[PDB]
Every structure is written in structure tokens, then in C-alpha cells.
Amino acid sequence: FKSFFPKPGTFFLSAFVWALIAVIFWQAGGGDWVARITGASGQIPISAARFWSLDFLIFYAYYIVCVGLFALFWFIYSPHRWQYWSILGTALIIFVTWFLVEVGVAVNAWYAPFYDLIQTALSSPHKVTIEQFYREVGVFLGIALIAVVISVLNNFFVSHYVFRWRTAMNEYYMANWQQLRHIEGAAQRVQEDTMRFASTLENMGVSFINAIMTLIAFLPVLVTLSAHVPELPIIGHIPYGLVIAAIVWSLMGTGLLAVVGIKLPGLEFKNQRVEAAYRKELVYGEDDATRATPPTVRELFSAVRKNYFRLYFHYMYFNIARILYLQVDNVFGLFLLFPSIVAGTITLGLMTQITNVFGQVRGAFQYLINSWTTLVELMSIYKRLRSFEHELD
Amino acid sequence: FKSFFPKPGTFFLSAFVWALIAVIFWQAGGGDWVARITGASGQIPISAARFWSLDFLIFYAYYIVCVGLFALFWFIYSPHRWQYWSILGTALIIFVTWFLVEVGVAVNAWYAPFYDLIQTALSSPHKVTIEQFYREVGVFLGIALIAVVISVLNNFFVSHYVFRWRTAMNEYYMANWQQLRHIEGAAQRVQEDTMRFASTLENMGVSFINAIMTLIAFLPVLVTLSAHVPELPIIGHIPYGLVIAAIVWSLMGTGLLAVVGIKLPGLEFKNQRVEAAYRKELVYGEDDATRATPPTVRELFSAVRKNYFRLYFHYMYFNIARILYLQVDNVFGLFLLFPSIVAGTITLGLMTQITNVFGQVRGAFQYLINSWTTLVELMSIYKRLRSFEHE
Known part of the structure; x- marks a missing residue:
């Protein structure tokens, strides 16, 4: 932690507080006040073009500024060798985790027009042409390519980010290797535990926020859907x-x-x-x-x-x-x-959209439930590393 | 392998050959010929009562006889200490893996009448009462309890079966401990590799047959569904x-x-x-x-x-x-x-049933795709173990 993040005791507390202020400001007055200055309407297209619309571009700039202000403060308060990976890298990982959630919200919003078309076709034969179905799938595919490209690049960066965490841990342990040489199982801690700790902690770190982001993203969806139920x-x-x-x-x-x-x-x-x-x-x-x-x-x-x-x-x-x-x-x-x-x-699209909202929330939480064994492994690894560092003194 | 199962070179070859003969005989003439003697109609109920119907009871007896004949031959040909776990235990695990697949087929068959009711309700307001929806969910729940009970008991037996595999391996290694004492990393192989080898091999062994069983079970389903497409x-x-x-x-x-x-x-x-x-x-x-x-x-x-x-x-x-x-x-x-x-x-039920068949086949194969890393782990463990006894 201390080898990768700058002052982990204060860094994570400051990050949580700064995120809370940024979230509170944006969700209460910041979101509307900035949009009025720029002139962005609430009409968000269901297609894949919503991710570079005016409303989404504003949030990209707002997230960059909030992270930049947080980064600049910690770049001057306490410089770190891995400050560009621990601070900026995590912000990218958090943002991509949010982006993949908003892709699922875009996909979920697509289930209403599509299944209303299916209901129209089934209700009366030879009323909906096959060309309409081809276009609707084309809309879904456009969102899919965005999901495919970002997810592929996300695993590439996450794996590289995790290895930098291992590199930071390995450099710290190998520097004072003479004092850590005599500890039993020292080779396993330096080699096996450093990668396991970074991979395990990052996996559930993203999984925890992804489950939270799934709730936050789909609560406004369910508030609008609850009018029909x-x-x-x-x-x-x-x-x-x-x-x-x-x-x-x-x-x-x-x-x-x-x-x-x-x-x-x-x-x-x-x-x-x-x-x-x-x-x-x-x-x-x-x-x-x-x-x-x-x-x-x-x-x-x-x-x-x-x-x-x-x-x-x-x-x-x-x-x-x-x-x-x-x-x-x-x-x-x-x-x-x-x-x-x-x-x-309700229509078949609303029926399927509401059911999909439950499914996406269920799938996000299932990864959290199935990771309870992973959590037990992480606590075991942390105790071994904490005892390993305690012997170093 | 040799410590848990009988002679692995012949036991697995005989099991594959005997299963092939049993599968071929049943799927060609055995299934109909036995049913004619017993007098079982082909109408399989969609509810949860199909699992103790005459058609399913006949297959339970056929599987028991085929496994029993296979077990009795290997109980006399070459006795083993873990013969009630390696032979009979695997047959139970294979059967339960098939049973959980047939539960999914029963669930898949339930999507046709349910979503035809949903289409009827949506197409005409105040046409389908809410009592019909309650009964249909009750049918699904009945199948769910069978799935819940068997899956809970399957995990209990699989974990106990895996530990007997580790117990068999540990007993073999600890007997000749003095010869394996000087091997580097011997403590890790006896303790950590034995449980890892058993857990990893069994997990993909069930996953492989589950993917095959899912495809086999849903092929006759798709042949009947392809008439409407x-x-x-x-x-x-x-x-x-x-x-x-x-x-x-x-x-x-x-x-x-x-x-x-x-x-x-x-x-x-x-x-x-x-x-x-x-x-x-x-x-x-x-x-x-x-x-x-x-x-x-x-x-x-x-x-x-x-x-x-x-x-x-x-x-x-x-x-x-x-x-x-x-x-x-x-x-x-x-x-x-x-x-x-x-x-x-096609109707909405046929639409959802066909889409569910693809989903069940997809989900079964995804466990195989996501386990490609698990294949690499097993080969590494096996090579470590194989060099351990080579000495």
C-alpha cells in the first residue's frame, strides 16, 4: 500500500471525501448548472452515439477536472514514484468500470423499442418488415462494438496496472532484502504473495464498486419504470x-x-x-x-x-x-x-426492460456473492504480508 | 489415478466402451423395447412430477443395471480399497450431472406455456386472471425445489468424493514417505498438490460432460422446435x-x-x-x-x-x-x-423456448471456455506430480 499509494491512511480517506463532495455537487446542482452553460438537452439517444453526445462529454470533462484537482493536490503534497499509476491509473479504472455500467444501461434501454417491435410483429403477421429487425440489431451491435473495444482495452490496462502494483511491492521488498532474508517463507511472500495480493485486491475492488455503480445507474431507471407498475x-x-x-x-x-x-x-x-x-x-x-x-x-x-x-x-x-x-x-x-x-x-418492451434491470443488478451482485471465497483468500494473504513486514520493522 | 481408481489404462477405456454400448443400445432399440414391456406412454409432464414418472423411472433402473454390471465386473476383476468411491461415486456424480441437465430441459419446456400465457394477457387486457400466473409460477417452483435439493446434495457429495481422492493420494504418498522424503518440495506435493489435483480434475471432468450432456439433451429439443422455423x-x-x-x-x-x-x-x-x-x-x-x-x-x-x-x-x-x-x-x-x-x-413461448435453448447451451459452454485457464493449472499440477513419483 505505502509502496504504491501516497500515504494510504490519508489518501483513501481524502479520495472518499473528495468523491463524495464531487458526487453530491454533481447530483444536486452541478449536473444541471453546467449543462445550462453548455446548452445540453436531456434527449439521450438509445443508439451508440450517446457516448459522445453533449451530456456525456460534459461528464467526461467534469470527471477529468475532479480527478485532475485531486491528482495535482497529491502530486505536490507528497510525490510518489508510482503516483501516475496509483492515482491516475485507478481513476481510469474507476471511470472504465462506470463506462461499462453505462453501456449496460444503454443496452437495457434498447430492450424496450426492440421487444415492442417483436410484440407488434407477433400480434399481426406481415406487419413489421425484416428490415426493421435488421436495423434494430444494428443499433445493438453499435453499442456492442463500443463494449467490445473498451472491455478489451480495460483488461489490458488492468493487467498492466496490477503488474505495476507487483513491481512496486517487489521493489520495496527487494530493497531491504537483507533484513527480510531470514524470514521463513520470504521467497513465497516476495514472489507469490505480491502478485496474488495485487490481483485479488484489485479484482474485488472493481467488483465492489461495479455492484454499487449498477445500483446507482439503475435506480433512476427504475424510478421512471415504476410509473407503469x-x-x-x-x-x-x-x-x-x-x-x-x-x-x-x-x-x-x-x-x-x-x-x-x-x-x-x-x-x-x-x-x-x-x-x-x-x-x-x-x-x-x-x-x-x-x-x-x-x-x-x-x-x-x-x-x-x-x-x-x-x-x-x-x-x-x-x-x-x-x-x-x-x-x-x-x-x-x-x-x-x-x-x-x-x-x-405495460408492453413487452417494458416487461423485458424491467426484467433486464433486475437481471443486470442480479449479475452484478452474483459476482460479489461468488467472490466471498476470494475475500477470505485476500485476508489470508494480507495477514501473511503484514506479518512479513512486521518482522522487517 | 492408480491409487484411487482401478487400473487407469483399462478402467477408463472399459468405462468409455461400456458407456458407448449402453448409449447405443438404449438410443436405438433399448429405450423403446424396455418401455413396451413396462407400458409407459411417451407423454412427459411439464411439471416437476416428470422426474418420478414411468419413463424416468425406467431410465433410473437401466442406469443402475448398467453401472451395476460394470461395477460387479471390476469388483471381481481387480478389487480396490476405494472402489465404492471411484467406481460407484463417479457413476453417482455422472448421473446427478445428467439429472441437473434434465432439470434444465424441464425448465426450458416450461417457458413455452408460460410465455404463451403472457402473450395472451398482453394481447387482451383482463383476459387472463392472476390466478393462472400464480399456478404457472408454482409449477416452476416445484421444479426449482428439486433443482435446489439435488444441487445442494450434489455439492455435498462432490466435495466428499474429492476429499476421498485426496485421502487416497495422501495415503499412497505417506506410505512411501521415506523414499519421497528427499524430493525437493515434497511437502507441497503431498499436501497442496493432492487436493488441487483432485479438485481441479473433478471440476473440469464434470464441466466437460455437462457441456456434452447439455448439447445431447437439447438436440432432440431443437429437432422438434425446428419444425416451426x-x-x-x-x-x-x-x-x-x-x-x-x-x-x-x-x-x-x-x-x-x-x-x-x-x-x-x-x-x-x-x-x-x-x-x-x-x-x-x-x-x-x-x-x-x-x-x-x-x-x-x-x-x-x-x-x-x-x-x-x-x-x-x-x-x-x-x-x-x-x-x-x-x-x-x-x-x-x-x-x-x-x-x-x-x-x-411462432408464438412468444416458442420464441422464448428456442432462445432459452441457445442460452442454456451457451451457459454450459461458457463454463468450459472460462475454464481454459483451469486446464493449464491441471497440466502444471500433473507434471509436478508425475515427476514426483518418477524418482
């Missing part, structure tokens, strides 16, 4: 139906799974301890003939087997909750629309 | 158009991605070599105070930088092909139906 199946009429139900289903559903699997991180940590003890005895017995004896390794593997069997038993309840939540989530989006579908207040 | 967009009329287009898009599309990423497994293996050389020097330098040699570790990490940078550049082309294929795959299912949608020869 005034009635809910069991809980009746609510001023904000879809927005409340989606938030409750997503956040509490994600929150409840964490509550069900509270014991899982503890069991995984214990599994790592018994495996390490089994490995540690084997390492000692590699040279000494009195170590790693049959009755010694028998009890150690029994502890490994017993704790692993405990993890499988507890993870069974997590599987029950996780899989049941996934199966219901496949039909929950349509379940909320049953009173509106019956009453004929 | 006589015209294709660019190639016009063609017999079995949906079946041919789906096979070409899926199999050749997956095959083309492997062709694009031919150099990727080679680059990953080289990346592991330069890491090993860098780690090997660091390990030696832990004790010796003269071979740390900051100039030496400078060149070793430079070789790490150059090879990783080469992997990132080549993987960019794979990303271009992979991501472009995924984006087109999202619309390819509907693209084939455009002449049918315009002519009004």
Missing part, C-alpha cells in the same frame, strides 16, 4: 413499487446470505490453519528422520479431515439459501409485474 | 435449420476461440517457468548471503516482466474474439427467428 401482487399499491421491491430483494437478499454464511469465513480460516500445521510438520520431516512420523501425520490429517468435513456441512446451509435465492430470482422480476401484465398497463 | 435469414430454407445453425454456432464458435488462443497455453507455461526460476533463486538466496545478487534478481524479474507483457498482448486478441462472440451470441438466437417472427409462424 402502480400495483404489486401482495403488498398492494405503493408510491414507489419497483424501486422499493428491487432494493429490498437485492440488498436484503445479499445481506441475508452474508448472515447465513457468517460462520463460513471462520471455518475457512481454521481450514487454512490445520493445512498449514500439516504442511509445517512435513517440512520439518523432510530432513529429520524423527519427524513426520506415521502416528504424528495421522492425527494432523485427521484434524484436516475433521475441519474440512465441518466446512462441507455448514456450507450445505449456505448452498440451500444461495441456490433457493437464485431460483426465485429467476421469476421474481416477472412476479412483480403480474398485476400490470394482467391489467394490460 | 422453416426459413432462416440469410441461407433461406434448409432442413433442420435450427439444429444446424445451433451446432455450427456453438461447436465451431467454441472451436474457433480455441484456435485463436492456441498460443495462450504455451505462454502461460512459460510464465510459470520464469516465476519458478525467480522463486528458485530467492529460495537459494534465503540462506546464502552472496547469491542474493541484486543484479541477478534484476534480470530474473525482467524475464518475468517480458513474458507477462507478452501474455497480456496475446490475450488481447483472445479478448477481442471472446467478447465479440459473447455480444453476438446475445442476439444470434433472435436473429435466426426473424423470418419466423415477421411471418407470424
Whole structure:
């Protein structure tokens, strides 16, 4: 952290505070006040040309200025060797993560005109020509090429950014290698842990903000869509139906799974301890003939087997909750629309757009849920590195 | 392999041959001939009760007999300690993998009546009551509970089966520990490689057959669905158009991605070599105070930088092909139906059922595509393990 980011204790606190001020200013008065000066209308095209429209160009300049002011302050307050990768590189990664989310919002907005065309064609034969379908797919493809080009370049930069984090960590560890030479497993920490720490931390760092950005991007979408869905199946009429139900289903559903699997991180940590003890005895017995004896390794593997069997038993309840939540989530989006579908207040495009919004939010959160094992790995790596640096003193 | 399974050279060859004979006999004459004796009609219910119907019960008995005959032969030909886990356990895992595929086929068949109801409701306000929608979701939920219960129990048994594989490997290595004691890194191989080898090999073993089973299960589905899709967009009329287009898009599309990423497994293996050389020097330098040699570790990490940078550049082309294929795959299912949608020869349920078939086949194959890195890990582990017992 200290080798890559400048003063991590204050840098991340300052970044969070500065981002909060920038977000608050833009979402309250900044967004409209800047647009009035430039003269940008709210008509955002559904096609791929919306990403270089006036409204999107303004946000590109606003993000650059906010990052530039943040970067210039930290370039003078405390210079760093990797300040161009830690500060500016993360801002690029955060921006591209937001951009790929807004591409999904553009794709989601395309599901309404397309499936309204499908409903028109199905409702009456020989009414919609095949040329209209070709153009609509052409609109989707235009957004797809933007998604393809940016995503391909995103993985290229993220991989290069991660390697610079490893390079920063490796340079710090190799500089004071003489004091770190005598630490047990020092070679693994310098080589295996530096790449693992950077890759793991960056992966869930992007995954966490991507899940948050998915909510932030689709909440205004659901507020506009909730006008066509005034009635809910069991809980009746609510001023904000879809927005409340989606938030409750997503956040509490994600929150409840964490509550069900509270014991899982503890069991995984214990599994790592018994495996390490089994490995540690084997390492000692590699040279000494009195170590790693049959009755010694028998009890150690029994502890490994017993704790692993405990993890499988507890993870069974997590599987029950996780899989049941996934199966219901496949039909929950349509379940909320049953009173509106019956009453004929929505079209097939609105039905598919609302269901897609739930699907995109579900997919963003699924990467977060499936990364709980990844989180346990990161804490294990960090503790090994923290102990490795503590010995350095 | 030899520690867990019976003789791997003949056991796997016999299993493949016996499965082929059982598959050929059942799919040609066995399926109908057994059904005629029992007297089971071909009408498979769409609800969750199809899994204990006469047609499915017959296949359960046929699979048990075929596995039992295979098991009894190998129980007498060459007894093994882990013969109830390697032989019978794998048969259970293969069967459950097939069962979860047939659950997806049952779910896919449910998309036709449900979305035909949705189209009816949308086409005429106040025509379909909300009670019909509640019942249809209840049908889906019944299938879901079977999927939930079996999947939860499948993961429980697979994890326990994998640990028995590690237990079999650990017992073999620890028995001859004195001979394997002097091998460098022996502690890592016995502890970490045994679980990694079992977990990795089993994961892709199920993933490979699941992709095959998904294609096999949905081919008869697409043959029946292709009757409602006589015209294709660019190639016009063609017999079995949906079946041919789906096979070409899926199999050749997956095959083309492997062709694009031919150099990727080679680059990953080289990346592991330069890491090993860098780690090997660091390990030696832990004790010796003269071979740390900051100039030496400078060149070793430079070789790490150059090879990783080469992997990132080549993987960019794979990303271009992979991501472009995924984006087109999202619309390819509907693209084939455009002449049918315009002519009004299909309904919304048929539209969604066909699109779901492509989605289920796509999702099954994506687990195989995303596991290409997992292939490289297994080969590295196997080579490390193979050199371990060579001694």
C-alpha cells in the first residue's frame, strides 16, 4: 500500500471525501448548472452515439477536472514514484468500470423499442418488415462494438496496472532484502504473495464498486419504470413499487446470505490453519528422520479431515439459501409485474426492460456473492504480508 | 489415478466402451423395447412430477443395471480399497450431472406455456386472471425445489468424493514417505498438490460432460422446435435449420476461440517457468548471503516482466474474439427467428423456448471456455506430480 499509494491512511480517506463532495455537487446542482452553460438537452439517444453526445462529454470533462484537482493536490503534497499509476491509473479504472455500467444501461434501454417491435410483429403477421429487425440489431451491435473495444482495452490496462502494483511491492521488498532474508517463507511472500495480493485486491475492488455503480445507474431507471407498475401482487399499491421491491430483494437478499454464511469465513480460516500445521510438520520431516512420523501425520490429517468435513456441512446451509435465492430470482422480476401484465398497463418492451434491470443488478451482485471465497483468500494473504513486514520493522 | 481408481489404462477405456454400448443400445432399440414391456406412454409432464414418472423411472433402473454390471465386473476383476468411491461415486456424480441437465430441459419446456400465457394477457387486457400466473409460477417452483435439493446434495457429495481422492493420494504418498522424503518440495506435493489435483480434475471432468450432456439433451429439443422455423435469414430454407445453425454456432464458435488462443497455453507455461526460476533463486538466496545478487534478481524479474507483457498482448486478441462472440451470441438466437417472427409462424413461448435453448447451451459452454485457464493449472499440477513419483 505505502509502496504504491501516497500515504494510504490519508489518501483513501481524502479520495472518499473528495468523491463524495464531487458526487453530491454533481447530483444536486452541478449536473444541471453546467449543462445550462453548455446548452445540453436531456434527449439521450438509445443508439451508440450517446457516448459522445453533449451530456456525456460534459461528464467526461467534469470527471477529468475532479480527478485532475485531486491528482495535482497529491502530486505536490507528497510525490510518489508510482503516483501516475496509483492515482491516475485507478481513476481510469474507476471511470472504465462506470463506462461499462453505462453501456449496460444503454443496452437495457434498447430492450424496450426492440421487444415492442417483436410484440407488434407477433400480434399481426406481415406487419413489421425484416428490415426493421435488421436495423434494430444494428443499433445493438453499435453499442456492442463500443463494449467490445473498451472491455478489451480495460483488461489490458488492468493487467498492466496490477503488474505495476507487483513491481512496486517487489521493489520495496527487494530493497531491504537483507533484513527480510531470514524470514521463513520470504521467497513465497516476495514472489507469490505480491502478485496474488495485487490481483485479488484489485479484482474485488472493481467488483465492489461495479455492484454499487449498477445500483446507482439503475435506480433512476427504475424510478421512471415504476410509473407503469402502480400495483404489486401482495403488498398492494405503493408510491414507489419497483424501486422499493428491487432494493429490498437485492440488498436484503445479499445481506441475508452474508448472515447465513457468517460462520463460513471462520471455518475457512481454521481450514487454512490445520493445512498449514500439516504442511509445517512435513517440512520439518523432510530432513529429520524423527519427524513426520506415521502416528504424528495421522492425527494432523485427521484434524484436516475433521475441519474440512465441518466446512462441507455448514456450507450445505449456505448452498440451500444461495441456490433457493437464485431460483426465485429467476421469476421474481416477472412476479412483480403480474398485476400490470394482467391489467394490460405495460408492453413487452417494458416487461423485458424491467426484467433486464433486475437481471443486470442480479449479475452484478452474483459476482460479489461468488467472490466471498476470494475475500477470505485476500485476508489470508494480507495477514501473511503484514506479518512479513512486521518482522522487517 | 492408480491409487484411487482401478487400473487407469483399462478402467477408463472399459468405462468409455461400456458407456458407448449402453448409449447405443438404449438410443436405438433399448429405450423403446424396455418401455413396451413396462407400458409407459411417451407423454412427459411439464411439471416437476416428470422426474418420478414411468419413463424416468425406467431410465433410473437401466442406469443402475448398467453401472451395476460394470461395477460387479471390476469388483471381481481387480478389487480396490476405494472402489465404492471411484467406481460407484463417479457413476453417482455422472448421473446427478445428467439429472441437473434434465432439470434444465424441464425448465426450458416450461417457458413455452408460460410465455404463451403472457402473450395472451398482453394481447387482451383482463383476459387472463392472476390466478393462472400464480399456478404457472408454482409449477416452476416445484421444479426449482428439486433443482435446489439435488444441487445442494450434489455439492455435498462432490466435495466428499474429492476429499476421498485426496485421502487416497495422501495415503499412497505417506506410505512411501521415506523414499519421497528427499524430493525437493515434497511437502507441497503431498499436501497442496493432492487436493488441487483432485479438485481441479473433478471440476473440469464434470464441466466437460455437462457441456456434452447439455448439447445431447437439447438436440432432440431443437429437432422438434425446428419444425416451426422453416426459413432462416440469410441461407433461406434448409432442413433442420435450427439444429444446424445451433451446432455450427456453438461447436465451431467454441472451436474457433480455441484456435485463436492456441498460443495462450504455451505462454502461460512459460510464465510459470520464469516465476519458478525467480522463486528458485530467492529460495537459494534465503540462506546464502552472496547469491542474493541484486543484479541477478534484476534480470530474473525482467524475464518475468517480458513474458507477462507478452501474455497480456496475446490475450488481447483472445479478448477481442471472446467478447465479440459473447455480444453476438446475445442476439444470434433472435436473429435466426426473424423470418419466423415477421411471418407470424411462432408464438412468444416458442420464441422464448428456442432462445432459452441457445442460452442454456451457451451457459454450459461458457463454463468450459472460462475454464481454459483451469486446464493449464491441471497440466502444471500433473507434471509436478508425475515427476514426483518418477524418482
